[PDB]
C-alpha cells in the first residue's frame, strides 16, 4: 500500500522536519509502496537518528494503519530516551593547567551551578569534534608548538544515559618565538610586511597571532591588489634551543582589476543610490579595504538588512574579478501598499498623523520629493521635503522644505501659548572626508505668537524686544519675520544604520539669525551618540547618546522663548512626560478670560489668586545637557526571525535644562533656574520593534533623582513611528 | 480571493512591453567594425504566428489524462 | 568651484611601474604581455588589435594624472608598436 | 488539513480546481492542488496537477514558490511536449518579479533598479524561442524579449551615467563596449554611444574617439 | 511538559519476603564516593583488612569485622580556595604483598603500603587507568582507556612493556581488566576481541574476535568488551556487549562453544555453570556445555542493577534505589531483599575472607555476613 501520510508524535525535544528528511533520505517516501515488514527497519532508522540527536536509549512505535484500498497512514510514536548528558570532561597529560582552564574554552560544560542555570550540558557527537579545536588552539596560543592531541575518546554509561569525554594530549613545551622571516614574492611591499611581522624576540610562540599574521598579510596585500595571495606560515622547529622560527612564504599574485560591480537582491532602490557610495571603482585595481568601505557606507545608508559581498574571479580570465554586493532592503513601507500607512500613536507629539511620501524621483531630474505629515496634540505640522543627498555626485547634498505649524503649547504640557508659524529651510551638505560632513544653509521663518498667558519668561523676552505688555490677560499677540543661517557638523562612524553597534554619531547643529532679522540670536545643539561593543557578536553594546544645548542673543537680547530646549520623553529623558524637565511656567496673577469653574485657569484672579505662582507646566530654557548611558542587550528568548533583529536595552538617563538668563536675584522666592544644578537621573528598560507597517518603541523607567514639580511617569511608547 | 474573467491574464500589470520600438540595426562605415555580438543576448526572428498579450492564453494545456 | 568640497580618490585603469612597463619589448606576444602587465582594462573594439593601458589617478581633487601606454599587435598576436605617452596639462 | 474534503477521485478534485480557477479563487485552488500533488507524486493527473499548481502560484502572486515548483517540474520532466508552456511560465515568473506597487502607480522608470530578474527572464525566454520556435507562445516571447533587451540596455545606460558623473572614464568605456558586445541593437545603446566619445576625450584617446565619432555621426538616421 | 522522564525501566520490588536474612553487619562513610560518576571503584579486602577509596582522593584501611579505621590518607591537591580540586581516583582496589594498587583518571597509578598508607610509588601511565590491577611476575598489569595495555614494574611503577589494541571512536565508559595465567595476560578490547599477551615481553600470543556486528552505528557495527575474561581449568570464558558469550582455548583462542546475547558486566563461574546478567537486567544461569540455560528469570528485568557475585549460595545484586537482592543458585527464586542504602549502588560487590562487601554511590561502605 501507498504511504498516504506519515503521522508524527512524541518528539518532545527533537526538531520536527528532521524526521521527514530522515525518512525521505532512507527511502519509503510519501506515496511509496510499503512492505509491511519494513516498518521495523523504518523504526530502526528513526531510532538511528535518535542516536544522531543523542538519545541512545530511544525507541519508536510505528502502527501501520489502513486507509481506503491501497492507502495507509503510518502512525509513529517516539519513546524519548533521556537526552545524553555529559557527566564530565577529563584530559590526560596535564601539568600546566587544571581542567577548568581548558573547559572554559569549550562550548561543552561539565557542571551547571546550584546558584544559576548557566548554559547546559546536552552532548552532541559533532560538538566535541569542533570544540577540541579550541583546546588545540589554546595550547598553541600559549606557545606549546610541540602540542598534539594523542587521541580523542568519548564514552557512554552501560544504561546509555550519560556521556564521558576523554582527551589525551602531549603538552610538549611552551617554546619561544625566535623571529619572523618572509619568503617569496612580496611585490615590493616588504617594508610594510616587516612592520606586520614586528614581534619581541624571546616571547612565547602564539598560534592565534600567527593566524592573525596570515590574515593581516592577506589584508595588507588587499590594500594594494592581490585578492588571492597564498601565505605559508609553516615554521622551523628548534627542539635543542626550545624555540620556533616563523618562516612565512608569501605569494603576491596580481594587481587584480574590478571588471564589474553588480548589486544583487537590490530592489526598489535605484542603482545610482547604491553605486555612488562605492569607493572601489569599476575599471580599476581592487583595494579590498575600499570594497569594505563600500560595505560600510552601504550599511550606513539605512536602506538595508545585512549587506553582503563577493569577489568572484571572472570566468576565463586570470586577473579580473566581479565585485558583487548583496542586499535586502529594510521594508520601511516605501515599496508596497499605500504611502507609509500614515497612522500612528503616542503621547509625545501625540496620537499622530505620522505620514510620509518618499522617492517620487521627480521627472527624472535627480531629486527626491516628499511630504511628511505630523498632525497631533503637540503640533499641526507638515512639510514639503525636497532633497537629493548627492545633488552633486562629487558629494554635495542639497535639500530643503517649507513647513507650517501653529504650535500648540498646553497641549504639549507647556505654559499656555499658541504661535501661527511657518518657514522655508534651504541647505547644502558639504562632505569633508572619508567619514565627516558639514551641513550649511539658509532659511526664512515666520512667527505669529498669540494666547500668551502671563508668566515671567516671555516677559523677559517681550521686554528685551521693547514690548512691555500688561500681565492682565492671555489675549495678547506678537509676530516676527526672521532670516536664519543654519549649519551642522556631522562625524559618523556608525557601523549600521538601524540599531548601531560600533562607532559614533556627532551632530553639532547650530543656527543664527542674520542682521536684518527681527530677533538677533543663535542656538547651538550638540547631539551625540557613541556605540562601543562588549561582545564580539555585537549584540551587547555600551551606548551613550548625549546632548548639549546653548544660545544667546546679540548684545544680550533674549532668544525666542519657543526656541528653548526641552527634555523628557522617550527620545531625550525617559520617565518624564514630553517636555516637563527644566524651568516651569510661573504665571503672573491675571484676569483669565472665558472663565468657568470646570477649567484649571491656574493663577487666575478669578479663583482668588494674588501673586506669582508655580505650576508643573514647562517652558524650557536656552541651556541643556543630557547623557543617556545604557547597555544594549540581545532580545530575550525571541530570535526566530533573528536577522531583522529586534532590540532591547537597559538605560540610565542623566540631564538638565536651565536658563542662564534666569534672574534669580529678582525672584529669590522662586526656584533658581539660573543654575545647571539639580541634574536629573532616570533609569529603566526599553524595547524597539520593526513592524513593516511602521516600527515601534517602548520604555519603562524609574526617575531616581526626581525634582520639584516634574510630571514624572513610569512608561511611554509609540506606534507606527520610527521617528 | 476572487477574480473576474480577465484578471485571468493580467500579470500584476499589463503589456507595457508590447508598445515599444523595434530593434536598432546599428551600422558603421569602412574602417569600423562593431564588436562581435555575444550569442547570450541574441534574439531569433520568427514568423509572427499567433496573438500576443492577454489576447493570447496562458491557461495550462491538458494532455491525454 | 570643485576645490571647496571632498571627493574620494578615484583610480582608473591598470596599475603600472617603470620596471614592469620596461618589460614590454618590440616583437612581444600577447600572453607574455599578459604576464608582464596583466590584461588591459580596455581594448579597441573597432577592428585592429591595439591594447590600452592607463594608470590614471585623481587624488584629493588635485592633479588628475596618468600614463597612457598604447600597444598594438598584428592580427597574429605579435606586438608592432609601443607608445608610453604621459598626460597632457591638467586642470 | 487545508480545507481538504477527506477525499475524492482525482476527476472530481481536478474539476473542482477548474471551478476555483474559473472562480479565480487562487487560494483554495492552491490548497486543493497541494493536496493532489502530495496525493499523487505519480498518477493519472500528476503532471496536470503540477501544471495547474504553477498557474495557481503565479496568479496568487506567490512567485518564489512558483519558480521553485517550475524548477521541480522541469527537473522531473524533460520530455513532455508541453514543456514550452512551462518555459514560458518560468520566464513570465522572472518577468513578474520586476514590479513594485508604488512604482507601478507612479510610473517612474523600472529600468535601473535590478537586472537579475531581467537576465533570468531573458535567458529562459530565449531558450524557449530558440528551442521551440514553432510554439504558440513564441511571438509574445519575442516581443517580451525586445522589452527585456531594452530593460538591460537602460540599466547599463544608468550605470554609464553615474560612472560618468563620477568620472570613472575607463569604467564607462568598458561598460559602453559592453552595451555593444551584448545587445548592440537598442535605442538605449544608440543613445549611450556619445558617452564613449566624451570619455575618450577625458582620457586624451583621440584616435579611439575618432573611431566612435564615425558611429554617432552615421546613426542619428539609418545608414 | 518540556522536561524528561522514562519509567519504562521500573520492574517492581519483589513480593518474596526474606526466606532467611543474612546479617547486615556494618557500614562506613568513606568520603564522597562517586555520586553520579560511573566506575568500578570498589573497595577490596586482604588479611582481614578492608581497603577503601574515594574519587575525591581519600583512602582508608579498615578493620574488616567492624570498619574501625586503621589509617587514612588523601591523594588530592590541597588548596581549593577559589574552586574545586579534581583528584579523580579510578578503578577497583586490589592488594598484594603489603601494597595497595589504585588507578586514576589523572592517569596516575599508585602503590600504597598496607602498613601506614605510604605511597610506595606513583607513576603516569598511557591513559586513564579504569582497570582493576593485577600482579604477576613482579608486574602490575594495566589496561588503559587509550587502548594501550601496560605492564608496570611493581617495585617502582616503571613500564615493563607496552601493547596496543584497535579502538572505536565511541565506546562504553568501562575497561576490561586482565587475568594472568599460563604465562599469558588476557584481556578484552572494544574492537570486539579478546587478546592474550606473553608477560615476559608483551608478545602477541593470540587474539579472537567475538563481534556481533549489527545495524548502522559504531555502537552497532563494533562491540565493547569491558567485561573480565575468566579462567577455569584451562578454558577461557569471555563476554561482550551484545557480543558472543563464548568458551575459548587458552592456546590460539579457538572457540570451544559460542552462545551470543552478551552483556556489559561481570559473570561468575562455579563448577559446571556460569551466572550472569543481561544488559536488560535479566538474570540467567548457563552450563559450561555450550552455554545452555540451567534457568533464566523474567522476575528480575530492566531496572538498574549492580554486577553479580556468588556468596554463601546467593547470587547477589544491588539497585540504584539502594536495595540488595539475593538470588538462589540451584533454582530461580529470590532469597531475600534488603534496603541497605538510599543513594544506590553502581560497582561490583566483593566476596573476600568470608565477608560480603559493597560500596554505595555516596561513599558509604556496607558489609554483609551470614
Write structural notes for this entry.
The complex is a heteropentamer of chains A (723), B (65), C (91), D (223) and E (370). With 723 residues, chain A is mainly beta. Chain A has 5 domains: 2-79, Ubiquitin-like (UB roll) (Roll), CATH 3.10.20.310; 85-170, membrane protein fhac (Ubiquitin-like (UB roll), Roll), CATH 3.10.20.310; 176-251, Ubiquitin-like (UB roll); 257-329, Ubiquitin-like (UB roll) (Roll), CATH 3.10.20; 419-681 and 707-715, membrane protein fhac: a member of the omp85/tpsb transporter family (Porin), CATH 2.40.160. Helix content of chain A is 14%, strand content 37%. In chain A, a hairpin with a 4-residue loop joins strand 9 (236-238) and strand 10. Chain B has 65 residues and is low in regular secondary structure. The two termini of chain B are 29 Å apart. By secondary structure, chain C is mainly beta. Helix content of chain C is 13%, strand content 34%. Chain C has helices at 18-21, 30-37; strands at 10-12, 42-43, 50-58, 65-73, 79-86. In chain C, a hairpin with a 5-residue loop joins strand 4 and strand 5. With 223 residues, chain D is mainly α. Chain D has one domain (1-221): Serine Threonine Protein Phosphatase 5, Tetratricopeptide repeat (Alpha Horseshoe). In chain D, 74% of the residues lie in helices and 0% in strands. Chain D is built from 11 helices and no strands. Chain D has helices spanning 10-23, 26-39, 46-59, 63-76, 83-96, 101-106, 116-131, 138-166, 169-181, 187-202, 206-219. The longest helix of chain D is centred in the C-terminal third of the chain and has 29 residues, at 138-166. The interface between B and D is large, with 50 and 66 residues. Strand 5 (148-156) of chain A pairs parallel with strand 14 (170-172) of chain E.
Look at the helices and sheets of chain B and give the structural class. little secondary structure
Could you tell me which chain pair has the largest interface and how many residues each side has?
Answer: B-D, 50 and 66 residues
Provide the gyration radius of chain B in Å.
Answer: 19 Å
Quick one: CATH class of chain C?
Alpha Beta
Residue fraction in strands of chain C: 25-35%
As an assembly, this protein is heteropentamer
Fold-level CATH name of chain C: Beta-lactamase Inhibitory Protein, Chain:B, domain 1
Radius of gyration of chain C: 15 Å
**What's the story with the biggest beta sheet of chain B?**
none
**CA-based shape of chain C:** elongated
Q: Fraction of residues of chain C in helices? A: 10-25%
What is the terminal separation of chain C in angstroms?
Answer: 12 Å
Largest sheet of chain C: 5 strands, antiparallel
**Which of globular, elongated, flat, extended, rod-shaped describes the shape of chain B?**
elongated
C-alpha end-to-end distance of chain B? 29 Å
Amino acid at each position: 500500500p501507498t504511504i498516504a501520510s506519515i503521522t508524527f508524535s512524541g518528539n518532545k525535544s527533537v526538531k520536527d522536519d528532521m524526521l521527514k528528511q530522515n525518512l525521505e533520505a532512507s527511502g519509503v517516501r510519501v506515496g511509496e509502496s510499503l512492505d509491511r515488514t519494513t516498518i521495523a527497519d523504518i523504526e530502526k532508522g528513526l531510532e538511528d537518528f535518535y542516536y544522531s540527536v543523542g538519545k541512545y536509549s530511544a525507541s519508536v512505535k510505528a502502527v501501520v494503519t489502513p486507509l481506503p484500498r491501497n492507502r495507509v497512514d503510518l502512525k509513529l510514536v517516539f519513546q524519548e530516551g533521556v537526552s545524553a548528558e555529559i557527566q564530565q570532561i577529563n584530559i590526560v597529560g596535564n601539568h600546566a593547567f587544571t581542567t577548568d582552564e581548558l573547559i572554559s574554552h569549550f562550548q561543552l560544560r561539565d557542571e551547571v551551578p546550584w546558584w544559576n542555570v548557566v548554559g547546559d550540558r546536552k552532548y552532541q557527537k559533532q560538538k566535541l569534534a569542533g570544540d577540541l579545536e579550541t583546546l588545540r588552539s589554546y595550547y598553541l596560543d600559549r606557545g606549546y608548538a610541540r602540542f598534539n592531541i594523542d587521541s580523542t575518546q568519548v564514552s557512554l554509561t552501560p544504561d546509555k544515559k550519560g556521556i564521558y569525554v576523554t582527551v589525551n594530549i602531549t603538552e610538549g613545551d611552551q617554546y619561544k618565538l625566535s623571529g619572523v622571516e618572509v619568503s617569496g614574492n612580496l611585490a615590493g611591499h616588504s617594508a610594510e610586511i616587516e612592520q606586520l611581522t614586528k614581534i619581541e624576540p624571546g616571547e612565547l610562540y602564539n598560534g592565534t597571532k600567527v593566524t592573525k599574521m596570515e590574515d593581516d598579510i592577506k589584508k595588507l596585500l588587499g590594500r594594494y591588489g592581490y585578492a588571492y595571495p597564498r601565505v605559508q606560515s609553516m615554521p622551523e622547529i628548534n627542539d635543542a634551543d626550545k624555540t620556533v622560527k616563523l618562516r612565512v612564504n608569501v605569494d603576491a599574485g596580481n594587481r587584480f582589476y574590478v571588471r564589474k560591480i553588480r548589486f544583487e537582491g537590490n530592489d526598489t532602490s535605484k542603482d545610482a543610490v547604491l553605486r555612488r557610495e562605492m569607493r572601489q571603482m569599476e575599471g580599476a585595481w581592487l583595494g579590498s579595504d575600499l570594497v569594505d568601505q563600500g560595505k560600510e557606507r552601504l550599511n550606513r545608508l539605512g536602506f538595508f538588512e545585512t549587506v553582503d559581498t563577493d569577489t568572484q574571479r571572472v570566468p576565463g580570465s586570470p586577473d579580473q574579478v566581479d565585485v558583487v554586493y548583496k542586499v535586502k532592503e529594510r521594508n520601511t513601507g516605501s515599496g508596497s501598499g499605500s504611502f507609509n500607512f500614515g497612522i500612528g500613536y503616542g503621547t509625545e507629539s501625540g496620537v499622530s498623523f505620522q505620514a510620509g511620501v518618499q522617492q517620487d524621483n521627480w521627472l527624472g531630474t535627480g531629486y527626491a520629493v516628499g511630504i511628511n505629515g505630523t498632525k497631533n496634540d503637540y503640533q499641526t505640522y507638515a512639510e514639503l521635503s525636497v532633497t537629493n543627498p548627492y545633488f552633486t555626485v562629487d558629494g554635495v547634498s542639497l535639500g530643503g522644505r517649507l513647513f507650517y505649524n501653529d504650535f500648540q503649547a498646553d497641549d504639549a504640557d507647556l505654559s499656555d501659548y499658541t504661535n501661527k508659524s511657518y518657514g522655508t529651510d534651504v541647505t547644502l551638505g558639504f562632505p569633508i572626508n572619508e567619514y565627516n560632513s558639514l551641513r550649511a544653509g539658509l532659511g526664512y521663518v515666520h512667527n505669529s505668537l498669540s494666547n500668551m498667558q502671563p508668566q515671567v519668561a516671555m516677559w523677559r523676552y517681550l521686554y528685551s524686544m521693547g514690548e512691555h505688555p500688561s500681565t492682565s490677560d492671555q489675549d495678547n499677540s506678537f509676530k516676527t519675520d526672521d532670516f536664519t543661517f543654519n549649519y551642522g557638523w556631522t562625524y559618523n562612524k556608525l557601523d549600521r544604520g538601524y540599531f548601531p553597534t560600533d562607532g559614533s554619531r556627532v551632530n553639532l547643529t547650530g543656527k543664527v539669525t542674520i542682521p536684518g532679522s527681527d530677533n538677533e540670536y543663535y542656538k547651538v545643539t550638540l547631539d551625540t551618540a557613541t556605540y562601543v561593543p562588549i561582545d564580539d557578536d555585537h549584540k551587547w553594546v555600551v551606548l551613550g547618546r548625549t546632548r548639549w544645548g546653548y544660545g544667546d542673543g546679540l548684545g544680550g537680547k533674549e532668544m525666542p522663548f519657543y526656541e528653548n530646549f526641552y527634555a523628557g520623553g522617550s527620545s531625550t529623558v525617559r520617565g518624564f512626560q514630553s517636555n516637563t524637565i527644566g524651568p516651569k511656567a510661573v504665571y503672573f496673577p491675571h484676569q483669565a478670560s472665558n472663565y468657568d469653574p470646570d477649567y484649571d485657569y491656574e493663577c487666575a484672579t478669578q479663583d482668588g489668586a494674588k501673586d506669582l505662582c508655580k505650576s508643573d507646566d514647562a517652558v524650557g530654557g536656552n541651556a541643556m545637557a543630557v547623557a543617556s548611558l545604557e547597555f544594549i542587550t540581545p532580545t530575550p528568548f525571541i530570535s526566530d526571525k533573528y536577522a531583522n533583529s529586534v532590540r532591547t536595552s537597559f538605560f540610565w538617563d542623566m540631564g538638565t535644562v536651565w536658563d542662564t538668563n534666569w534672574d534669580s536675584s529678582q525672584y529669590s522666592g522662586y526656584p533658581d533656574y539660573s543654575d545647571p544644578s539639580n541634574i536629573r537621573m532616570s533609569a529603566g528598560i526599553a524595547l524597539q520593534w520593526m513592524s513593516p507597517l511602521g516600527p515601534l518603541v517602548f520604555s519603562y523607567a524609574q526617575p531616581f533623582k526626581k525634582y520639584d514639580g516634574d510630571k514624572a511617569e513610569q512608561f511611554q511608547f509609540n506606534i507606527g513611528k520610527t521617528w | 480571493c476572487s477574480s473576474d474573467s480577465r484578471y485571468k491574464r493580467q500579470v500584476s500589470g499589463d503589456e507595457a512591453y508590447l508598445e515599444a520600438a523595434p530593434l536598432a540595426e546599428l551600422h558603421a562605415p569602412a574602417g569600423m567594425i562593431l564588436p562581435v555580438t555575444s550569442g547570450d543576448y541574441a534574439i531569433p526572428v520568427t514568423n509572427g504566428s499567433g496573438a500576443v498579450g492577454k489576447a493570447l492564453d496562458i491557461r495550462p494545456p491538458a494532455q491525454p489524462l | 568651484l570643485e576645490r571647496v568640497v571632498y571627493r574620494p580618490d578615484i583610480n582608473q585603469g591598470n596599475y603600472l611601474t617603470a620596471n614592469d612597463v620596461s618589460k614590454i619589448r618590440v616583437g612581444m606576444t600577447q600572453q607574455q604581455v599578459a604576464y608582464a602587465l596583466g590584461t588591459p582594462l580596455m581594448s579597441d573594439p573597432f577592428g585592429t588589435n591595439t591594447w590600452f593601458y592607463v594608470f590614471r589617478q585623481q587624488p584629493g581633487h588635485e592633479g588628475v594624472t596618468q600614463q597612457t601606454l598604447t600597444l598594438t599587435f598584428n592580427s597574429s598576436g605579435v606586438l608592432t608598436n609601443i607608445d608610453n605617452k604621459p598626460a597632457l596639462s591638467g586642470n | 488539513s487545508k480545507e481538504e474534503v477527506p477525499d475524492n477521485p482525482p476527476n472530481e478534485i481536478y474539476a473542482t480546481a477548474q471551478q476555483k480557477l474559473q472562480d479565480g479563487n487562487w487560494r483554495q485552488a492552491i490548497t486543493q492542488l497541494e493536496a493532489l500533488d502530495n496525493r499523487y507524486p505519480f498518477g493519472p493527473y500528476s503532471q496536470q496537477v503540477q501544471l495547474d499548481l504553477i498557474y495557481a502560484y503565479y496568479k496568487n502572486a506567490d512567485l518564489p514558490l512558483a519558480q521553485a515548483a517550475i524548477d521541480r517540474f522541469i527537473r522531473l520532466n524533460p520530455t513532455h511536449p508541453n514543456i514550452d508552456y512551462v518555459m514560458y511560465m518560468r520566464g513570465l515568473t522572472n518577468m513578474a518579479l520586476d514590479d513594485s506597487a508604488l512604482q507601478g502607480f507612479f510610473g517612474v522608470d523600472r529600468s535601473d533598479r535590478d537586472p537579475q530578474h531581467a537576465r533570468a527572464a531573458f535567458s529562459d525566454f530565449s531558450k524557449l524561442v530558440r528551442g521551440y520556435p514553432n510554439s504558440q507562445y513564441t511571438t509574445d516571447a519575442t516581443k517580451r524579449l525586445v522589452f527585456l533587451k531594452d530593460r538591460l540596455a537602460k540599466y547599463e545606460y544608468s550605470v554609464a551615467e553615474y560612472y560618468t558623473e563620477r568620472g570613472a572614464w575607463v569604467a564607462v568605456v568598458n561598460r559602453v563596449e559592453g552595451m555593444l558586445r551584448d545587445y548592440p541593437d537598442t535605442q538605449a545603446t544608440r543613445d549611450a554611444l556619445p558617452l564613449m566619445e566624451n570619455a575618450y576625450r577625458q582620457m586624451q584617446m583621440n584616435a579611439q574617439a575618432e573611431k566612435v565619432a564615425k558611429i554617432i555621426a552615421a546613426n542619428s538616421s539609418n545608414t | 511538559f518540556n522536561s524528561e522522564e522514562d519509567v519504562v525501566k521500573m520492574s517492581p520490588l519483589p513480593t518474596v519476603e526474606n526466606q532467611f536474612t543474612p546479617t547486615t553487619a556494618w557500614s562506613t562513610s568513606v568520603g564522597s564516593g562517586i555520586g553520579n560518576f560511573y566506575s568500578n571503584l570498589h573497595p577490596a579486602l586482604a588479611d582481614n583488612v578492608v581497603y577503601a577509596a574515594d574519587r575525591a582522593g581519600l583512602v582508608k584501611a579498615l578493620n574488616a569485622d567492624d570498619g574501625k579505621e586503621i589509617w587514612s590518607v588523601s591523594l588530592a591537591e590541597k588548596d581549593g580556595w577559589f574552586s574545586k580540586e579534581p583528584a579523580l581516583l579510578s578503578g577497583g582496589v586490589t592488594v598484594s604483598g603489603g601494597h595497595v594498587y589504585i588507578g586514576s583518571e589523572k592517569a596516575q597509578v599508585y602503590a600504597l603500603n598496607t602498613s601506614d598508607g605510604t605511597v610506595a610509588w606513583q607513576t603516569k601511565v598511557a591513559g586513564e587507568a579504569l582497570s582493576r590491577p593485577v600482579v604477576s611476575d613482579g608486574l602490575v598489569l594495566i589496561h588503559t582507556s587509550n587502548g594501550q595495555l601496560q605492564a608496570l614494574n611493581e617495585a617502582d611503577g616503571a613500564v615493563k612493556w607496552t601493547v596496543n589494541l584497535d579502538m572505536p571512536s565511541l565506546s562504553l565508559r568501562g575497561e576490561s581488566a586482565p587475568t594472568t595465567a599460563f604465562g599469558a595476560a588476557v584481556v578484552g578490547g572494544d574492537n570486539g576481541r579478546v587478546s592474550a599477551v606473553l608477560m615476559e615481553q608483551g608478545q602477541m600470543i593470540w587474539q579472537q574476535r567475538i563481534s556481533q556486528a549489527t545495524g548502522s552505528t559504531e555502537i552497532d557495527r563494533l562491540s565493547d568488551v569491558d567485561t573480565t575474561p575468566v579462567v577455569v581449568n584451562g578454558v577461557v570464558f569471555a563476554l561482550a556487549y551484545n557480543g558472543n558469550l563464548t568458551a575459548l582455548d587458552l592456546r590460539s583462542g579457538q572457540i570451544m562453544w559460542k552462545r551470543e546475547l552478551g552483556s556489559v558486566n561481570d559473570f561468575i563461574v562455579d563448577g559446571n555453570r556460569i551466572y550472569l546478567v543481561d544488559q536488560n537486567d535479566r538474570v540467567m544461569a548457563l552450563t559450561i556445555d555450550g552455554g545452555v540455560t540451567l534457568w533464566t528469570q523474567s522476575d528480575l528485568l530492566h531496572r538498574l542493577l549492580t554486577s553479580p557475585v556468588l556468596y554463601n549460595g546467593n547470587l547477589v545484586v544491588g539497585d540504584s534505589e539502594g536495595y540488595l537482592h539475593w538470588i538462589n543458585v540451584e533454582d530461580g527464586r529470590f532469597v531475600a531483599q534488603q534496603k541497605v542504602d538510599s543513594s544506590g549502588f553502581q560497582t561490583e560487590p566483593v566476596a573476600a575472607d568470608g565477608k560480603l562487601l559493597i560500596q554505595a554511590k555516596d561513599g558509604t561502605v556496607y558489609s554483609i555476613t551470614r
